Amino acid sequence: MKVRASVKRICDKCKVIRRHGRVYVICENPKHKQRQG
Ligand SMILES: [Zn+2]
């Protein structure tokens, strides 16, 4: 797991989750489901 991707929410309905020093990106839009690292 290498944290180095712009996971910042893409659209307005995106949402970022905070995890063990890591982060996530869930959203209604499937193209926005990402993960920090
Ligand atoms: Zn989104």
From Swiss-Prot:
Binds 1 zinc ion per subunit. InterPro entries: Ribosomal_bL36 (IPR000473), Ribosomal_bL36_sp (IPR035977). GO terms for biological process: translation. The keyword Ribosomal protein applies. Zn(2+) binds at residues 11, 14, 27, 32. Keywords: Metal-binding, Ribonucleoprotein, Ribosomal protein, Zinc. One of its GO terms (molecular function) is metal ion binding. Its cofactor is Zn(2+). The keyword Ribosomal protein applies. GO terms for cellular component: cytoplasm; ribonucleoprotein complex; ribosome. PANTHER family: 50S RIBOSOMAL PROTEIN L36, CHLOROPLASTIC, LARGE RIBOSOMAL SUBUNIT PROTEIN BL36C. Belongs to the bacterial ribosomal protein bL36 family. Part of the 50S ribosomal subunit. This is Large ribosomal subunit protein bL36. It comes from Thermus thermophilus.
